[PDB]
Structure formats: structure tokens, C-alpha cells
Structure 1
Amino acid sequence: ASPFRLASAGEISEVQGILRTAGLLGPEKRIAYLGVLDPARGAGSEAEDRRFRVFIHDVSGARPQEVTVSVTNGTVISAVELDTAATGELPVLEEEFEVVEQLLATDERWLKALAARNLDVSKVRVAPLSAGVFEYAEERGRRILRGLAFVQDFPEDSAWAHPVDGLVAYVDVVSKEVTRVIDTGVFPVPAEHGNYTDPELTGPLRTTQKPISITQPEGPSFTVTGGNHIEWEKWSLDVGFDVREGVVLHNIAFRDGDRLRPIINRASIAEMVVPYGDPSPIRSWQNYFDTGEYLVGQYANSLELGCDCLGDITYLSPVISDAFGNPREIRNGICMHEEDWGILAKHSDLWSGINYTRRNRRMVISFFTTIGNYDYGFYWYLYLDGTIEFEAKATGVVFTSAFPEGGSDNISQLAPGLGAPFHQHIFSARLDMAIDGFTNRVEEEDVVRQTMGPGNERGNAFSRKRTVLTRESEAVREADARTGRTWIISNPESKNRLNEPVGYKLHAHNQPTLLADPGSSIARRAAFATKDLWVTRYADDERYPTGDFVNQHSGGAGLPSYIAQDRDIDGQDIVVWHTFGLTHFPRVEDWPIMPVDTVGFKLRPEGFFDRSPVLDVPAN
């Protein structure tokens, strides 16, 4: 009965029928995106209307469409023809992955390049890479993918060990034309394999690891009702799933005594981008938006008990649409479980004689996605003490190149002849804030150093200052680790027992933001990634920091367009957008398969409660 419930197979089958009947799902059509729309603000009228948004691609070159349909009312609400030279191309289709390799396999320029390197075309895999927007005027309005080649020695070989450098091709996947084949020189194809299941590479496997058994003999402490509504240790929330964003958290709230107190209305990773820092023409165009161009949710893995998730696991199996509107279950796509988290609070008092120890725990909601060479785990954590944390875990295989004779300032060597270009992995968290309700504001908090002198005679004092961000034009903020800079989201109309506004503090990891030159194409297309923190006024249609159609969009859409409205954000319905990322100079230890590295952020209560909220936790 909940409007925030997951999409069902039947809902998607109804959408397909509505689209078909309306003439919008002919045999040349493909669904490139399908997702449920969130309820509008002020839907508390209790009139459920399950609406879906659909992007429809046309493989014959007709104009794609954006369609909204109501499954509640069985009708098409709106259907808009898109001009992609203007607003951007639709996301990459899974079925286009193979089309780049097959189109090149009959191109005479491509075959000529492979023949000069003595490569059998049947062994050559071609990565289908998003094109971006660069200097090629013939690409405007065309659906382009670029291809980089890797050799597979045999069908189980790891092709990433064998990049074919000095060669790139551009393909129009609608008209099935190879527009350009660039061959800048022959590089030796690196010879060593990277087959990390080969006993010859792994050596004998360890016999020394003894099992760790994690069990919950009376079951888990959380309940799941209505398919996706979680209650756990005073927390309440709904777990959603979107094919673009992946796991989305709705209605995060905390039961403080009798009141259910809202904290976050909607939390998601709304974009991610991987820019490469290699100036070679073979790769200098390479930047993929896994979220906005490829849709990370449709590549979610089926997670295996005991391998991917350990302990007493509850699964959710979200349903998405395939390219024809058929429902597709992602079996065991979301893992949910609670984890011991060490000591929560501890004190042995010399004067009272009381010895006090309490254990912490956290609720984990996670999913794992794979897009080509890279694999990412997205983890949301809820802690007993009111802390909310996000963690991204990056693993998979690094994207490779040749390592040039005589070295490189922008590539590291992983193996003889084998290089890994420098790159970043940058995420945008979109936090639709609702601290005790919707009237919120953001303050920037800096440590303040004080000089020795009158009133500070021993030179020990220090303080802090808070600056309210009142309008969108002043709410684009940078990190400053040296001044301990954090941001507090408060509700000026909701006070704690000390008559101070209730709040939550955002703690960032303060990693570098986008390194590319501010005049570059990527700095325009990924403008969100150039600053650590943005605050906007909530609006229904301002969903992604990069805009709705990221693929081949020329830049400036999303956040820099939103904030030009200069709306009032001082005690209003606001959205915080936090940029965070990893700068990756690949190491030898990252090869042939990369150990997990992590990045994230956390929010901690800041005078939200009237005292510690974990005084009622028992002693195990």
C-alpha cells in the first residue's frame, strides 16, 4: 500500500501494454530507461498515482521520446519527442555493447590496423566507450561510441592484460557506420596474461585461513514490511531501487521516544564519473559516467550468500524492465544485514566505581554493480548512535594501455609493457534533506584560530565560526581540511531542550575534486565534480547533477543551471549535493585484479537529540 514500494513485475507489464497500445513500442523501439517517479510534494491527500518515466530509443534513426505513464490510470500522461543535438543522447543500451566490435570487424581500415599487428580479428574484443563531446562536428546529433581494442588469447583469457594501443575507432551505432579509424603507431601488445584464477599465477592456494562463522540464532533485529520498509533500532526507512541510480533510500527517520523524527527525505548516488588523465589522443577523450551514461542499477550483481554477504542476510530482488518492456528480476540484488561494530561507549570511573561498556552495531544495505572492467559496491550504514554513513568500494580490473618505452608522466607501469593511465572516480551524493521536517538551512563551520593577547593571555584559545548559506549563488562550497571545515544542516524552527536548532553535521573525506583544466570538455560536462558541496532549493525536476541526458551532452546542464536561479535556501526545502572521490595512481598491487579501495562520507547528529540517544542500549 506504500507509495514508496518497489516496482512490481505486474506494474512493468502494464507499462509495456500502455506503451504498445499507444503506438510507442514498435519493433524499432527500445526502452533505454524505465523508473518509478517519486510522489510529489503534498501528495498527503491520499490519492496514490503510480507514475513511470520512460526513455524510448529508435534503432531506425527516428527521434527518441520521453514518456510519462500512470499505471494507476492506465494512461499516457505525456510523450515528448527529443532533439538529441540539443538535450543529449539517451543512455547506452546493453545491446549496443557488441555492436561496436561487430561493426569494426568488417571495416577495411580496422582490419588493416589489426593485420599490421598480426592480430586475428576473431580474438579482438572492443570496449564500447561513451564518446563525450569534442572537436568532431560530424558527431552532433549522432549516436556515437568509441572503441578501444583488447586481445583475448582464448575464450577464458582476461583481455585487459592485452591492450592494443595506438588505435581507436569511432562508430555511429544507428546508421552502422565507422566514422573514423585512428592509428597513431604500433605498440607491442603486452604478453603476460592476467588470469587471476590460473594456478600458475596464484601459486598454491592458502591452507591457513580458518572459518569465521557469523550467525544470529534468534534472527535479525530488523523487520521488513510492505516489501521494502525497514525498522531497525529506532530507525525507519524505505529501500528503493532505480535502474539509473541503484539503491535509493527514502524517508529516513528516527523514533525518538514517541516522535518519528525525519532526517533525510531521499538519499542516492545521483552521478558518478571516471575521468582519465592521459593526454594521448588514443585516450584523452575518455570519461565515462557510469550512472548517467550506462545506468549502474541494470548491471547490479546477484549477490551470493557466504561470498558477497556474510551472516544472517535478508535479500531484496528488484524488478527492472528489459529493452522491450519485459520485467526482469535481479535475484538477490540487495543485501541487508546488521553487523557488530565494536565498542559504542565505555567508561570505568575512579570515583563512582561504576564500570560501563556497550557494544555498537550497524545496519548495512548494499549492492554491487559491474560495468565492463570496473566493479563497485555501494554501502549505506545506519548506526545505533544516529550516524549515517555511505561507502563506495572500488575493485575489478584497472583500465590498461601500453606502457611507453621511456616512461610516462600520466600512466603507471603494472607489468612488462603494460600501463594503467591515471584517473579519478568521482561520486555525487544527492541528499534531499528533511531534518525534523522540511524547513532546513546549511551552515559552513570553520575552526577559528585566536592570537595570544588580551582575553587570551596564554595563547590557548580557539573557537569556531558558522556561516549560513542564504541563497543558491553563495552555496557552492570548497573543502578546507586545514580549518576542519564541515557543514551543518539544521532546522531553525525545531529546537532541542537547550533552545538550540537541531542539526546534523556532514563530515567529508576532503579528497581532491576534479583535476582537469577548467576549460576542458569534462569540466563543463561534470561541473558538479569541481566543488565539494552544492545546496539547491528542492524542485521536482532537478534530479541529477549532470542533467537528464548525460550521453554526448555538450555541458553546463544540471547543477550550474539550477543554482543560477538563485533561490532562497535559508529555512526552506533544500537538497545537498556532495562531491567525493578517489584519485587513482595505479600501483603494481592493483594488478591483475584490484583489492578494494574505499571512499565516502558520514553525517552525525549535532544537537539533534537532547542527550546521547543510546542510553537505553542493554549490556549484551
Structure 2
Amino acid sequence: ASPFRLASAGEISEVQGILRTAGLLGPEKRIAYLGVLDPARGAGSEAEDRRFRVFIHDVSGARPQEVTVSVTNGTVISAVELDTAATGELPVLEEEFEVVEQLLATDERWLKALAARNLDVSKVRVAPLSAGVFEYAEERGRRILRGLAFVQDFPEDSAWAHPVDGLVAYVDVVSKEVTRVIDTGVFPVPAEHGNYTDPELTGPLRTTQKPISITQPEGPSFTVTGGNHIEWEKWSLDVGFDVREGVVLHNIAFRDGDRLRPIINRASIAEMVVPYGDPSPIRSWQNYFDTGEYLVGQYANSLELGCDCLGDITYLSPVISDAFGNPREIRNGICMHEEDWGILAKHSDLWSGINYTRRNRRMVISFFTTIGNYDYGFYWYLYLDGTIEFEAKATGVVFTSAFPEGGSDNISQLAPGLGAPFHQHIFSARLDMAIDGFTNRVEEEDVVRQTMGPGNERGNAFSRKRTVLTRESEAVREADARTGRTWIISNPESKNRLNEPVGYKLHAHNQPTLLADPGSSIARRAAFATKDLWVTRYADDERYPTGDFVNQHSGGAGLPSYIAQDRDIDGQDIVVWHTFGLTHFPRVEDWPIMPVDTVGFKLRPEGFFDRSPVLDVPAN
């Protein structure tokens, strides 16, 4: 019944049938993206119209189309032809990955480059990577992938251990032609294997780890109704899934007495970019927009009980479309469970004689995706005390290169002759805020130091200052760890019992933002990543910080063009966009497979409640 329910296999089948009968899904067509549209703004929305947005690619070279269909009425609502030289190319298709290696294997220039290195072409894997926009005028309007080569010594070998440096190729995946093959010189192919399951490398496995058993003998404390509606320890929310963004949280609300109080209307990771900082022409174009270009939801892992998710686990199995419109289930793609989280509150009072201890816990909603060599876990946490937290976990295998003789200022050495270029992993969280309703505002809070003098004779005083962000042109903010800078989202029309606006405080990790030169292509295409915080006025079509079609878009789409409207955000329906990321100088310990590193952010109540909201937690 809920408009926020996960797409079903039947809905996707009906979308396929509607497109085919409309003539929009012939044999040269591919679905590059399909997803359900959220309901438009309207608190009296009663008639359910479930609609899907579809991007349709054409493998024969015709212009692609953006289509909106209504599965409820069985109709096409609109179909627009796209001019990709203007507004960007469609996301990369899974079937285009294989094309790159196959086309190169018959190209005379590629084979000559391999022959000079004495590499058997049957052992050379090609990583198919997004192209970006650089100096090559012939690429405008064409779907290009760029290929970098790795040697696989045998079928189970880790090819990442054996990069073929000094060589790159560009491929038109529609006309199926190799546009350029660039050979800048011969580098030795690193010879050590990186096979982390080979006993010769691992040594004898440890026998010292004893089991940890985590069970819930009465079942979990949360309930799941309607397929994806969660109720847990006064929290209420809907868990969505979109093939582009992955797990999306809707309608995050907290039951305060007899009142269901909204907090966040929609929470998602709306983009993530991985820019590389190696100036070699072999790699200086390399920037992954994992969300915008590749679609992180379509590569979600099936998560195995006891290994990926430990404890009393409830799974969701989202359904997505394949390239032809057939439904495909991601079995066990989302894990949900509660976890003990240590002490919540504790005090032993001398005067009253009362000793008080309570334990904390958190609800975990997670999924894991694999894009080539990297694997990312996305974790949303709800805590008893009203805190909301997001954490990204980065693991997998680092992207490699040769390590040049003489060293490098932009590449780490991991093994003899094996390098790992410096890079970042930068995320954008899109938080469509709804603190006690939709009339919200953002304040920047800095610590204020005070000078010793009159009214501060001992020089001990300090204070804080809050600055209201009233218009989009002033709502592009930077972190300042030194002044303890945070941002508060409040509702100026909803007061707590002390007559103060209710609010939530955003605590950032204050990691470095995008390091590339401001005049670079990546800085223009990933402009969101240059600043820590953006606030926009809500609009239906402003979904991603990089725009709708990120692949080979020349730049400026998304947040810089939204902000340019300079709209009122002082007590309005607003969206907070938080940039946060990891700067990765690879270390020897990251090889041959990388231990998890993490980054994230959290939101804590700030006068949202009239007192601590966990006074009714029992002792157990």
C-alpha cells in the first residue's frame, strides 16, 4: 500500500511490456537506468501513481531517450530524445565492459605494443574505465571508454599485481573502433603475485581465534512491515533501493510520546568520485564517478550470513532491471540488524547513593558494492539517543601502476616495481531535511575565543556564534576544525519547552576536500567535492550533485547550476549536501588486499527533545 515500497518484479515486468508495446524497446535498445520516482510534494497525496524513470540507450547510434512510465495506468507519460553532446552521455552499460578487451585484441597497434613486451594477448585483461572530458575534440558526442592493461598469469591470478604501464587505449563502444593507442615507453611488468588465498603467501592459517557467538533468543527488536517499513526503538523509516544510489532512507521519524516527529525526508549517497593524482598521461584522466557513471546499486553483493553480516540478520532482496527490462533479484543485498553499542549513560552518585548504568544499541542498515578492483560498504546507523550516522568502508584491491626507477612524488611503492597512485574517495550525502516539518534553516556554529579583560578578568571565558544561511549564494561552506565548526538544521517555527527552535547538529570528520587544481576538468565536473557543505532549496528535478548524466559531461552540472538560482533557504524546504572523503596515500599494508578504512558523518539532536530521550530505557 505504501508509495515508498520497493519496486517489485511484477512492476518491472509491466514497465518492460509498456515500453515494448510503445515501440521503445526494440532489439537495438538497452535500459541503462530504471528506477521508481518518489512522490511529489503533497501532504494530501491519496491516489497512488507509481512511476518509473528509464534511460534508453541505442546500440546502433540513434539518440537515446529519457522515458517516464506509469505502471498504475499502464501508460507512457513522456519520452524525450536526448542530445548527449549537450547534456551528457548515459551511464556505462555492463555489456560495454567486455567490448573494450575484445576490440583491442584485434587492433594492430595494441598487439604490437604487447608483442614488444612479450605479453600473450590471451593473458592481458583490460580494465574499462570512464573517459571524462579532456582535449580530444573527436570524442564530443561519442561514447568512449579508456582501457588500461593488466596481466593474468593463470585464470585464478590477481591481475592487479601485474599492471602494464606506459600503455593506454581509447575505444568508441558504439561504432566499435579503437580511436587511439598511446605507448609512452616500456616498463617492466611487476612479477610478484598478489594472490591472498595462496598458502605460499598467507602461510599457515591462524588457529588461535575462538568463536564469538552473537544471538537474539527472542528475535530482533525491530519489525518490518509492508516489505520495507522499519520500526525500531521509537524510530520509523522506509528502506528504499535505487540502482544508481543504492540504499536510500525515506521518512526518517522519531516517536516522541504520542507524536511522530519527522527528521529527514530522504537520505542517500548521491554521488561518489575517485580522482587519481598521478600526472602520467597514462592515468591523468582517471576519475571514477561510481554512482553517476557506473551505478553502484547494480553491482551490490549478495551478503553471506555469518561472514558479511553476523548476528540475527533480516535481509531485503531488492529487484532491479537488466539491460533488456527483465527483473533481476539481488538476493540478500541488504542486511539489517541491531548491535550492542556499549555504555549509553552511567553515573554513580555519592550524595544520593544511586548507581545507574544503561547500555546503548544501534540499528544497522548496510549493503556492499564491487566496482572493478574496489569494494565499498555503505552503513547507516540509528542510535537510541537520536543520533543518525553514516559510515563508508573502503576495501578491495588498490589500483596499481609501475613504480618508476628513481621514485615518484605521486605514487607509493607496494612491492618490487609495483606502484599505487595517490587518489581520493569523495562522497556526497544528500539530506532532504524535514526537522519537525519542512520549514527548516541552516546555521553555521563556530567556537568564539574571548580576550582577557573587563567582564573576563581571569581570561577563562569562551563562547560560540551562529550564522544563519539565508540564500543559496551564501550557502556554500567550508569546514574549520580549528574553530570547531558544525552546522545546525533547525525549524524556526517548532520550539522545545525552553522556547528554542528544535534542531539537529551535523558533525563532519573535516577531512580534505578535492585536491585537484581548480582549473582542472575534474574540479569542474565534480565541483561538489570542492566544498564541505551546500544547502539548496528543494526541487523535484535536483537529484544529484553532478547532474543527471555525468558520463562525459563537460562540467558545471548539478550543484553549481542549482546554487546559481540564489533562492531563499531561510525557513524553507531545503536540502543539505555534505561532501566527505578519504585521501589515500597507499601503504605497504594495503597490499595485496586492503584492510578496511572508514569515513562518515553524524547528526545529533540539538534541543530537538525537551530532555534526554533515553530515560525510559530499562536496566536489563
TM-score (norm 2): 1.00
Post-superposition CA distance 1:331-376 (Å, at most 9, x none): 0000000000000000000100000000000000000000100000
Deviation (angstroms), 1:178: 0.2
Q: What is residue 82 of structure 2 aligned with on the other side?
A: 82
State the alpha-carbon separation in 1 of the partners of residues 89 and 104 from structure 2. Answer: 22
- TM-aligned CA deviation for residue 486 of structure 1: 0.0
Moved over 4 A (4+): none
The answer to whether residue 539 in structure 2 is matched with residue 539 in structure 1 is yes
Q: Which runs of 5+ in 2 are unaligned?
A: none
Distance, in Å, in 1 between the alignment partners of 2:138 and 2:43 is 46
**Cα deviation, residue 19, structure 1:** 0.3
Aligned-partner Cα distance in 2 for 1:51–1:396: 36
Q: Which residue of 1 aligns with 2:217?
A: 217
Task: Please give the per-residue CA displacement for 1:253-283, whole angstroms capped at 9, x wherever unaligned.
Answer: 0000000000000000000000000000000
Deviation string for 1:393-439 (max 9, x for gaps)?
00000000000000000000000000000000000000000000000
> Per-residue displacement from partner, 1:230-273 (whole Å, max 9, x unpaired)?
00000000000000000000000000000000000000000000
For residues 107-138 of structure 1, give each alpha carbon's deviation from its aligned partner in whole angstroms, at most 9, with x where no partner exists: 00000000000000000000000000000000
Q: Distance in 1 between matches of 2:11 and 2:123?
A: 42
Post-superposition CA distance 1:551-576 (Å, at most 9, x none): 00000000000000000000000000
CA distance in 2, matches of 1:126, 1:58: 24
Cα shift readout 1:57-96 (whole Å, capped 9, x = no counterpart) = 0000000000000001100000000010000000000111
Which SS does the other structure have where 1:595 is aligned? strand
Shift of 1:192: 0.1
For 2:485 and 2:324, how far apart are their aligned partners in 1?
A: 49
Counterparts of 2:419 and 2:247, CA distance in 1? 34
Q: Deviations over 1:156-196 (max 9, x none)?
A: 00000000000000000000000000000000000000000
SS in 2 for 1:303: coil
Deviations 1:145-164 (A, max 9, x none): 00000000000000000000
What is the rounded CA distance, in whole Å, between the counterparts of 1:309 and 1:300 in structure 2? 14
- Match of residue 608 from structure 2: 608
- Give the Cα–Cα distance (whole angstroms) in 2 for the partners of residues 73 and 506 of structure 1: 42
Q: d(CA) in 2 for partners of 1:533 and 1:557?
A: 17
In structure 1, what is the Cα distance between the partners aligned to 2:192 and 2:326? 43
What is the distance in 1 between the residues matched to 2:98 and 2:159? Answer: 15
Mark the runs of 5 or more structure 1 residues left unpaired by the alignment: none
Q: Using the alignment, how far apart are the partners of 1:444 and 1:44 within structure 2? A: 34
Q: Distance in 2 between matches of 1:439 and 1:7?
A: 30
Shift of 1:45: 3.0
CA distance in 2, matches of 1:554, 1:50: 33
Cα distance between partner residues in 2 of 1:43 and 1:112: 65
CA offsets, 1:445-481, max 9 Å, x none?
0000000000000000000000000000000000000
For residues 48 and 476 of structure 2, the distance between their equivalents in structure 1, rounded to whole angstroms, comes to 36
Q: Output the CA distance in 1 between the equivalents of 2:556 and 2:535.
A: 17
Aligned to 1:583: 583
Matched residues in 1 for 2:278 and 2:230: separation?
A: 45
3-state SS of paired residue (1:297): helix
Q: CA deviation at 1:285?
A: 0.2
1:596 is paired with a residue whose SS is strand
Residues of 1 paired with 2:118 and 2:445: CA distance?
61
**Cα RMSD (Å):** 0.3
State the Cα deviation string for residues 312-340 of structure 1 (Å, max 9, x = none). Answer: 00000000000000000000000000000
Match of 1:328 in 2: 328
Match of 1:390, SS state, is: strand
Cα drift, residue 44 of structure 1: 2.2
Q: Displacement of 1:14 after TM fit? A: 0.2
After TM superposition, the score normalised by the length of structure 1 is 1.00
Residue correspondences, number? 620
Partner of 1:553: 553
> Paired residue for 1:347?
347
- List per-residue Cα deviations over 1:192-217 (Å, max 9, x = no partner): 00000000000000000000000000
Inter-partner Cα distance in structure 2 for 1:453 and 1:480: 27
> Could you report, residue by residue, the CA deviation over 1:506-541 in whole angstroms, capped at 9, with x for unpaired residues?
000000000000000000000000000000000000
Distance in 2, matches of 1:473 and 1:77, equals: 35
Q: CA deviation at 1:484?
A: 0.0
Distance 2:331 2:96 in 1: 24
Measure how far apart 1:615 and its partner are: 0.1
- For the residues of structure 2 that align with 1:316 and 1:270, how far apart are their CA atoms? 21
Percent of residue pairs bearing the same amino acid type: 100
Instruction: Find the residue that maps to 1:109 and give its secondary structure.
Output: helix
Query: 1:135 corresponds to which residue?
Result: 135
Deviations 1:16-68 (A, max 9, x none): 00000000000000000000000000162301000000000000000000000
Instruction: Find the residue that maps to 1:163 and give its secondary structure.
Output: coil
1-structure distance, mates of 2:339, 2:53: 36
Q: 3-state SS of the aligned residue for 1:122?
A: helix
> What is the DSSP-based 3-state SS (H/G/I as helix, E as strand, rest coil) of the residue aligned with 1:214?
strand
1:54 maps to 54
> How many Å separate the matches in 1 of 2:495 and 2:78?
44
* 2:574 equivalent in structure 1: 574
Structure 2 counterpart SS, 1:103? helix
For residues 489-522 of structure 1, what are the alpha-carbon distances to aligned partners after superposition, in whole Å with 9 as ceiling and x for unaligned?
0000000000000000000000000000000000
- 2:272 is aligned to 272
Distance in 1 of aligned mates of 2:481 and 2:77: 48
Give the Cα–Cα distance (whole angstroms) in 1 for the partners of residues 377 and 293 of structure 2. 18
In structure 2, how many angstroms separate the alpha carbons of the residues matched to 1:298 and 1:45? 30
In the alignment, the residues of structure 1 paired with residue 589 and residue 570 of structure 2 have an alpha-carbon distance, to the nearest angstrom, of 48
